C-alpha cells in the first residue's frame, strides 16, 4: 500500500469534488437548493431574497474549496522540490547525504514514473558478516609514533594488520600505508611492534 | 463507520465517526420563594386613566 500516498492525491481531489457538488444540494435557508424552481415560482422582488441567501452560501463554499487546494498544492511543490533535489543529487550523482538518498551507503538512484508521482529506487549498500577485532589508536616502532594514512590499526590477536574503515581487508603494516608523526609519549594505548620497510 | 465514510466497504483503522455524547437526565427549575399576587391585571379595567 505504498501508493496510498498517491491514492490520497486522488482521494483529497475526489472528496472535495464530491463535497462541492453536494453543496449545490444545500439551500442555505432558502426554499430550494435548485435555482430555476425559485425563478419559476416567485417574482424577482421576492425571488431576489431567496437567491440572496443562495449565492452567499454558494460563494462561501467555493472559496473554501480553493483554500484546501492552496494548502495542498503548496505541500505538493514542497514535496516536488524535495524530489527534484533527489534527481539533482541522488539520481544524477552519488551523494554523501545520509538517508536523503535512502538508508545505507548510496550507490545510485532510479526514477520510475507513476501517475502524479515518481517512484525513486535508492540502491544502497548495507555491510554484513561482522566480526570483533582488537584495535589500536597508534603504533610506535622505533620510539617514533606511526599513524595510518588511511584505514584502521586492526588485530586478529596473532598479528597487527591494517584494513579500511568500511571493510575487512587486512594488510601488512608498511611505511607506505602509515605516516610517522612525533614520538610515542602522549598516546594512550600505544602498541610496541614492528613496522615493515619494503 | 459506513455512513461517515459514505462507503459500504470500511477499510482498516481508526475512524472518528460519531462526534456525539451529552445527555439530559433530570430537570431542575428553581423559581424564588414568592407566593403573592400583585396589581398587574387591575390597572387596565376601569375609569380614571
Amino acid at each position: 500500500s505504498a501508493l496510498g500516498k498517491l491514492q490520497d492525491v486522488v482521494n483529497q481531489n475526489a472528496q472535495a469534488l464530491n463535497t462541492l457538488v453536494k453543496q449545490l444540494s444545500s439551500n442555505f435557508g432558502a426554499i430550494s437548493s435548485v435555482l430555476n424552481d425559485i425563478l419559476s415560482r416567485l417574482d424577482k422582488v421576492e425571488a431576489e431574497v431567496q437567491i440572496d441567501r443562495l449565492i452567499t452560501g454558494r460563494l462561501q463554499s467555493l472559496q473554501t474549496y480553493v483554500t484546501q487546494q492552496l494548502i495542498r498544492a503548496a505541500e505538493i511543490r514542497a514535496s516536488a522540490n524535495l524530489a527534484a533535489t533527489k534527481m539533482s543529487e541522488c539520481v544524477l550523482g552519488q551523494s554523501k547525504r545520509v538517508d536523503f538518498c535512502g538508508k545505507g551507503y548510496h550507490l545510485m538512484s532510479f526514477p520510475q514514473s507513476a501517475p502524479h508521482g515518481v517512484v525513486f529506487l535508492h540502491v544502497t549498500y548495507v555491510p554484513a558478516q561482522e566480526k570483533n577485532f582488537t584495535t589500536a589508536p597508534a603504533i610506535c616502532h622505533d620510539g617514533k609514533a606511526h599513524f595510518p594514512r588511511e584505514g584502521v590499526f586492526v588485530s586478529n590477536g596473532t598479528h597487527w594488520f591494517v584494513t579500511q574503515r568500511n571493510f575487512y581487508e587486512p594488510q601488512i603494516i608498511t611505511t607506505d600505508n602509515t605516516f610517522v608523526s612525533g614520538n610515542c609519549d602522549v598516546v594512550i594505548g600505544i602498541v610496541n611492534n614492528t613496522v615493515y620497510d619494503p | 463507520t459506513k455512513c461517515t465514510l459514505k462507503s459500504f466497504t470500511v477499510e482498516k483503522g481508526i475512524y472518528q465517526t460519531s462526534n456525539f455524547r451529552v445527555q439530559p437526565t433530570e430537570s431542575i427549575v428553581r423559581f424564588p420563594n414568592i407566593t403573592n399576587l400583585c396589581p398587574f391585571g387591575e390597572v387596565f379595567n376601569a375609569t380614571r386613566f
Partner: protein
C-alpha cells in the same frame, strides 16, 4: 463520473506533458545514467 462533474461548470485540465512524454524522459534519464554515468549532468 466525469460527465456529471463536467455539467456543473467544473473542468479537469489535461497536462502539457503526457505520460509517454514522461516515459520518454525517464528512459532518457536512465540511458545517460548507464552510458554517461554522471558526466552528462555537469556538462557534455
Amino acid at each position: 463520473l466525469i460527465c456529471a462533474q463536467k455539467f456543473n461548470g467544473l473542468t479537469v485540465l489535461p497536462p502539457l506533458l503526457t505520460d509517454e512524454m514522461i516515459a520518454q524522459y525517464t528512459s532518457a534519464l536512465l540511458a545517460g545514467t548507464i552510458t554517461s554515468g554522471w558526466t552528462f549532468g555537469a556538462g557534455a
